[PDB]
Amino acid sequence: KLIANQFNSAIGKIQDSLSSTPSALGKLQDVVNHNAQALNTLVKQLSS
Amino acid sequence: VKNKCVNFNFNGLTGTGVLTESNKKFLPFQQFGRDIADTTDAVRDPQT
């Protein structure tokens, strides 16, 4: 019973920890931002 | 001419593409429209 209760509490706290952290999902966002930045600079360099 | 891939020349502004009725509010002193990366996106009809 104690182990099950501890597991339930930890799983419940996981979602709040993910929501509260500002840079928890940083790596995926950096990947997306790098791809977008590369495309943007490629498009903008046509004006040179 | 609308809804066809057309070669348009608006007061010297030359381009190729299809035209669609707009829903954005241009200011009376603005005649061009540019999106990010300086791509032409909207234009006012000089007559109507």
Curated annotation (Swiss-Prot), chain B:
Changing residue 14 to K: In strain: Omicron/BA.1. Attaches the virion to the cell membrane by interacting with host receptor, initiating the infection. The major receptor is host ACE2. When S2/S2' has been cleaved, binding to the receptor triggers direct fusion at the cell membrane. When S2/S2' has not been cleaved, binding to the receptor results in internalization of the virus by endocytosis using host TFRC and GRM2 and leading to fusion of the virion membrane with the host endosomal membrane. Alternatively, may use NRP1/NRP2 and integrin as entry receptors. Binds to host ACE2. RBD also interacts with the N-linked glycan on 'Asn-90' of ACE2. Cleavage of S generates a polybasic C-terminal sequence on S1 that binds to host Neuropilin-1 (NRP1) and Neuropilin-2 (NRP2) receptors. Interacts with host integrin alpha-5/beta-1 (ITGA5:ITGB1) and with ACE2 in complex with integrin alpha-5/beta-1 (ITGA5:ITGB1). May interact via cytoplasmic c-terminus with M protein. May interact (via N-terminus) with host bilirubin and biliverdin, thereby preventing antibody binding to the SARS-CoV-2 spike NTD via an allosteric mechanism. This is Spike protein S1. It comes from Severe acute respiratory syndrome coronavirus 2. The lineage of its organism: Viruses, Riboviria, Orthornavirae, Pisuviricota, Pisoniviricetes. The gene is S. The chain holds residues 534 to 581 of 1273 of the full protein.
